[PDB]
Amino acid sequence: EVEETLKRLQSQKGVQGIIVVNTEGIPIKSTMDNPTTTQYASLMHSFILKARSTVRDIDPQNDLTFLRIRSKKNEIMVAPDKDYFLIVIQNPT
């Protein structure tokens, strides 16, 4: 079921890859090449920790809901969860 929905997302014209980060920055599923698989998973793990803390710091009664990062090259979206988040990368062009 979820395998089909992930493929469905991957088929979207914007999406350039999906990484399922599970073990604290170490993913278990990917539709991307190995260097990118680890690159995005690791970097975004560090970032989301900062983003979630940022929310707790700006207000001590709230957690993260979502983050978006945009760049000239590509755009990356992540959502927080109880155990682990998911990374999706799109080509804005």
Binding site: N22, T23, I26, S30, T37, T38
Partner: protein, 46 residues
């Protein structure tokens, strides 16, 4: 009328050299290791 001549002598002494020194230092060197025993994507089945 009786003047007696006498000679007196005191004992000698003995000294010894010695030294003092505060606590000593010594160098040290460390290099932090950067091990990364991390695979790319282990397909877990937890």
């Amino acid at each position: 009328i009786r003047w007696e001549t006498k000679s007196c002598q005191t004992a000698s002494i003995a000294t010894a050299s010695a030294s003092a020194q505060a606590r000593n230092h010594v160098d040290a060197q460390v290099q932090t290791e950067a091990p990364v025993p991390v695979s790319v994507q282990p397909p877990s089945q937890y």
